[PDB]
């Protein structure tokens, strides 16, 4: 998938990624606190930025696997990981932002 690769490159090196990680930081601050949200909030800022980009990439590659992917496929792949997201509230937040980024580059 070409645009996935460029989306990810934009996340790591472009302004798109700076906007992503600022959104994520505030959403993770605003969420009801978990041990995982606290450790992210306590990370040094540059490391937190890197982890949040990596965590977003994990969900993008979950929703988009192959150049064949169509937005119809998003729902199955989200439900496949839904039980995981239920015990990982921070990942649920990050999955929502990946969903929006991924939808804008697929079918």
């Amino acid at each position: 998938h070409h645009m996935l690769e460029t989306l990810i490159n934009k996340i790591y090196t472009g302004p798109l990624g700076e906007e992503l990680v600022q959104t994520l930081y505030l959403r993770i601050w605003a969420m009801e606190e978990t041990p995982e949200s606290l450790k992210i909030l306590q990370m040094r800022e540059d490391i937190r930025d890197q982890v949040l980009k990596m965590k977003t990439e994990r969900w993008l590659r979950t929703l988009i696997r192959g150049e064949k992917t169509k937005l119809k496929d998003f729902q199955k792949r989200y439900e496949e990981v839904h039980p995981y997201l239920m015990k990982e509230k921070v990942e649920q937040v990050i999955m929502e932002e990946a969903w929006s980024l991924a939808a804008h580059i697929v079918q």
Binding site: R44, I47, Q50, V51, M54, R61, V81, P83, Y84, E88
Partner: protein, 124 residues
């Protein structure tokens, strides 16, 4: 006290067996960096239950994020890069059928014990 630590104390004859075990099965880098976490999980159950294996697959990716943040604190740019490569490869290789990752992990940990068995029996 980890099984990974004990394996590394064996004689070269048995370390060679561990090398062969980790020839294109599961990445040895991950086996080492997540040794404590990997040795805790019930991979046998995961190898027989798709839904549980799917949780453990995504648990593993998140444990690699935790490893990344430690190496980042240590200013270790190569291992930061290697963790990211490791995550990508695991997702490429196993996300379509994550139960197969659990089968492989359980099997590797089993073979490690058999190698350890040789080493203690050969030592006498």
């Amino acid at each position: 006290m980890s099984q990974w630590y004990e394996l590394q104390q064996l004689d070269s004859k048995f370390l060679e067996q561990v090398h062969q075990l980790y020839d294109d099965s599961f990445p040895m880098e991950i086996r080492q960096y997540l040794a404590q976490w990997l040795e805790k999980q019930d991979w046998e159950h995961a190898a027989n239950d798709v839904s549980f294996a799917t949780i453990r697959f995504h648990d593993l990716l998140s444990q690699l994020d935790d490893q990344y943040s430690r190496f980042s604190l240590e200013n270790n740019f190569l291992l930061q890069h290697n963790i990211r490569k490791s995550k990508r490869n695991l997702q490429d290789n196993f996300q379509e059928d994550p139960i197969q990752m659990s089968m492989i992990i359980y099997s590797c940990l089993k073979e490690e014990r058999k190698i350890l068995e040789n080493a203690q029996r050969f030592n006498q």
